[PDB]
Amino acid sequence: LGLEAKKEENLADWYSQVITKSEMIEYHDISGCYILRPWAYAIWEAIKDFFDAEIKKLGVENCYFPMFVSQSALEKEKTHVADFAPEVAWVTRSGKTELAEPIAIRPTSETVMYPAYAKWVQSHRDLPIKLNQWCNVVRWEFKHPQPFLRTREFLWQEGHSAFATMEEAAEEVLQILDLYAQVYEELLAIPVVKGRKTEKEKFAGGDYTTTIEAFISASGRAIQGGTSHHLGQNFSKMFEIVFEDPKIPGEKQFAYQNSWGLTTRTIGVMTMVHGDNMGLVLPPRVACVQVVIIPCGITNALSEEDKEALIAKCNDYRRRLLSVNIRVRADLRDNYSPGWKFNHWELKGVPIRLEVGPRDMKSCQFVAVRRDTGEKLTVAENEAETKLQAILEDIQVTLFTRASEDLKTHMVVANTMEDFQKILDSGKIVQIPFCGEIDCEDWIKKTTARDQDLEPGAPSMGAKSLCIPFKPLCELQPGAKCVCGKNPAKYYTLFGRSY
Amino acid sequence: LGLEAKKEENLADWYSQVITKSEMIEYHDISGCYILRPWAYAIWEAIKDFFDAEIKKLGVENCYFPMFVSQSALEKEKTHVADFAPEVAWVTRSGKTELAEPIAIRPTSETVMYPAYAKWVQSHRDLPIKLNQWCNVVRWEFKHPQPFLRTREFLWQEGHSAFATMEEAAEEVLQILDLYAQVYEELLAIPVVKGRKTEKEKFAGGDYTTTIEAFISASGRAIQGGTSHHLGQNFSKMFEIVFEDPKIPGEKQFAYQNSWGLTTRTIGVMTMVHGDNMGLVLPPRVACVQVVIIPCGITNALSEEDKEALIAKCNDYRRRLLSVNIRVRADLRDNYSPGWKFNHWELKGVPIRLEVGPRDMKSCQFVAVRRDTGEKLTVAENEAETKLQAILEDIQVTLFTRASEDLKTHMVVANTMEDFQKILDSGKIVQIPFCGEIDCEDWIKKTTAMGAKSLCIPFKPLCELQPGAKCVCGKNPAKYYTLFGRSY
Ligand SMILES: Cc1cc(N2CC[C@@](CO)(C3CC3)C2=O)cc(C(=O)NCc2cc(F)cc(-c3cnn(C)c3)c2)n1
Ligand SMILES: Cc1cc(N2CC[C@@](CO)(C3CC3)C2=O)cc(C(=O)NCc2cc(F)cc(-c3cnn(C)c3)c2)n1
Ligand code: PRO
Ligand code: PRO
Ligand SMILES: [Ca+2]
Ligand SMILES: [Ca+2]
Ligand SMILES: [Ca+2]
Ligand SMILES: [Ca+2]
Ligand SMILES: [Ca+2]
Ligand SMILES: [Ca+2]
Ligand SMILES: [Ca+2]
Ligand SMILES: [Ca+2]
Ligand SMILES: [Ca+2]
Ligand SMILES: [Ca+2]
Ligand SMILES: [Cl-]
Ligand SMILES: [Cl-]
Ligand SMILES: [Cl-]
Ligand SMILES: [Zn+2]
Ligand SMILES: [Zn+2]
């Protein structure tokens, strides 16, 4: 029948079973390449529709840049290329014919886009430039891939803005990060922690990186859900993105830049956070189908005239819901049982199942079964639009509240290395006082791996920084020491085992 | 102060200046690849809106398949692979590490998708499968690229359907071809000829190819606008897309498949067809901005009272046009002159410019300027909504009528090789009685020389083939009238 893999036993096999039986993912014959079937792609589209509308309000415009980079352009920002070079895929021939020059597939589009920005900017009035594109990128790592979360090819949005002043750029970084938090929290019903990446973890070639971190309670691990960088002038100086202002005559000034990105990793996090042992669970805000209508109790005995009346009543509900902007499907096919339909649509995580039997049809009522809790309700026909809308809104709230509770009990403060170690081995993420230096972050990773006390099902790995929270749980006492002991702490920092 | 190159002189240079000064295209530092700036991308989004909605009504669903394909999957259909192999780009290393096996970038996704289709079809009840994707493909030809029309990488949509019976597949082929004709004719105001590709020109690995053909009179050359193929069973026998017959126990049947594609070549044809010596000209149906509002007559003389009232009048036209679902921009920027704006939006082909100066505000009226004809109209204020919509519709009709006249002018019939050659070097396309044989089509190309090629066998030819006509080669009897011409 349905799912038989259990989430609290083997998470990896549960994850693979859920994403395939929900018809979200299919495996491609190339490792780390995954097919996004319609049930998953529609979630990406719901994300796209929301985010596109929001950034359009900010003045951002969509466009499409080439997928290839020249070796010359790829290497102009040395920090950036040093970080990305081992995983850049190279095209070297066409047919059997060697190319003029090997060309790179974009791992990210800074080095594709910024020679164009340098052309388009001549005067102070050519700024700001605010472009976004929905496209695929390729990061050809040889580590083990995981669908949605960590893949060699993925779909994303990347935004790239260039400003005359640091004030404007700084403002945008946080506006975009707020939108990413809205994607996770309002659409996907996933709570996130906003923060700044440490020096170790920031975008190579950027000034600073801001992030949203989500928590996967089944793992005890956290994952970076989205990212908003201030690149400063590090790319404009290397690509000659210069203007002249009459206020500062003669001197050429370098543009201040941001880039920001969000991928289909979103869909994996929603799968990990909300899925259960019956399969996927979709937040109503992104569900391709919010209500599935299924005609029940049909036997051989049912009169043919009665049967037609039943299929017509199911289509009645469908049209009523379509007219109130509820996304809806009537699973009317003859070639599957009611039980098989119940199971099929539960695996796919449809928020509400609408059951219509001949008895309920004739009594002008129906049954609504919520997916998150399995609770059932008998509803009078005349109320369908009203109550279904409310159940949808309650489902969204409930999913978020549950996930918020988990976050609140798995994120705590510790003020010493020993307490940090212990709390971390209990499967939580921890805010600790931290010196910020890259070397101390390496030492933290090394020794929390070394000193790990293994709880039965837990991952065996060192702790990494996640973000410096904008709003820590507590305020740093004056003169507090980092967990390293030898440097004063600069801020509370969230640390955990992570993806 | 705008366009200097003339369309009737060096067309290629006109095209280059129009697509750059309308801020549609930028050159990338890799030869032959182009940046789609927002002005162009927004047209592609309009096309996508229409077409996405329509194919959703047909039961088609969007997905995303990998961009990479393995050697073994690529060569399973021999005809298809042979035709695409010289233009397939190959990834051979990541960083410095040579890859174990080179992997290919998709030129088209039949060989990416159809292994999965074979997994998904378990039974008659798993059909039909109807999938579409909006994505990029690479066809690395070493010939001279041309923005929009012929490019090494381009955005498209590719739809791929598998059915249990040929009757279903055949129906869908024509429904999609009709939607492509609607994109060109209702959205882009470009007339097209529907037809079938000759044996020579049909999609490699398919049984037949339906197409829409457009005509660029500045060139005398035709261009293939969009195509819908019936792949028959050629691919399902190679990739084992099978289901058991519901009535004959044990007998496996091979699914009947179609595929159909439409690319950003659309935008290029729109530019070549409607553009003039002032620049781009947008059909209102796909125009990002349908009406641009431009304040005029601001001087240092004008009082702050008067300037702020003028700006507010502009914003009230903005609100009222947004209210009636006219896509409007108010260009209220102070650091650009009104002349600069007139030029900027003319080059970008905005259908209507709405000028408001102080005296016009004080006369409760404004000036509307149609981009296509250059005609200025004075419009009372209270009529803004209804008049502007009228003009927008008239613009769309006018662009389509002119272009339609052009095609009627440049597509004529001929029944000999002599007049075929005369009318062809006339800069026109000719329907001629044709035998359909490949050797004779090679021959027509060799004789006509740039040689003419076949374009389509029109669904609705201009004349009925009169009983027993012979083909222009002379050796054989004709089988159908066939559209021929020089081609992009
Ligand atoms: C889907 C996706 C999203 C993001 N990121 C990063 C940026 C961010 C942050 O939010 C968003 C754009 C801004 C995001 O989503 C990063 C990757 C990725 O690095 N892919 C390559 C790869 C392939 C592979 F086979 C294995 C591994 C791998 C890595 N460790 N292990 C143990 C295996 C990595 N992939
Ligand atoms: C944008 C686009 C659209 C279509 N197609 C074809 C199919 C169709 C029509 O319906 C749609 C998919 C269904 C369409 O739009 C085909 C190409 C293309 O073959 N590109 C490769 C290339 C690169 C290059 F640098 C030069 C040349 C080249 C070829 N001759 N010359 C004189 C130069 C070719 N490109
Ligand atoms: O890869 C990154 O993280 C940045 C954000 C999107 C574009 N590049
Ligand atoms: O390239 C072509 O012509 C067909 C139709 C789109 C997918 N393959
Ligand atoms: Ca769907
Ligand atoms: Ca690094
Ligand atoms: Ca790296
Ligand atoms: Ca990291
Ligand atoms: Ca130090
Ligand atoms: Ca223990
Ligand atoms: Ca635009
Ligand atoms: Ca070829
Ligand atoms: Ca047999
Ligand atoms: Ca047989
Ligand atoms: Cl299972
Ligand atoms: Cl080359
Ligand atoms: Cl736990
Ligand atoms: Zn420290
Ligand atoms: Zn002949």
Numbering used by the authors:
A (entry chain A): 1014 to 1512
B (entry chain B): 1014 to 1462, 1474 to 1512
What does the paper say about this structure?
Aminoacyl-tRNA synthetases (aaRSs) are an essential enzyme family for protein translation and, in several cases, have been validated drug targets. In the current study, we examined five ATP-mimetics L95, L96, L97, L35, and L36, based on the 1-(pyridin-4-yl) pyrrolidin-2-one (PPL) scaffold. We successfully co-crystallized all five compounds with TgPRS (L95, L96, L97, L35, and L36) and three with HsPRS (L95, L96, and L97), all in complex with L-pro.
The loop 1152–1165 exhibited ligand-induced fitting, and the residues Arg1152, Trp1153, Phe1155, Lys1156, and Arg1163 formed a cavity-like structure to fit L95, L96, and L97. However, three out of five PPL derivatives, i.e., L97, L96, and L35, were found to be selective against TgPRS as opposed to its human counterpart in vitro, with enzymatic selectivity indices of 27.9, 13.5, and 8.2, respectively. This is due to a slight displacement of the hydroxyl group and, in turn, a slight downward displacement of the entire cyclopropyl-oxo-pyrrolidine group, sufficient enough to overcome the hydrophobic environment resulting from the exposed cyclopropyl core. In addition, the guanidinium moiety of Arg1163 is slightly displaced away from the pyrazole ring to form an H-bond with the OE1 atom of neighboring Gln1159 resulting in loose stacking of the entire 4-(3-Fluorophenyl)-1-methylpyrazole moiety in the ATP pocket. This is also evident in the rotameric conformations in Lys1156 and Phe1155.
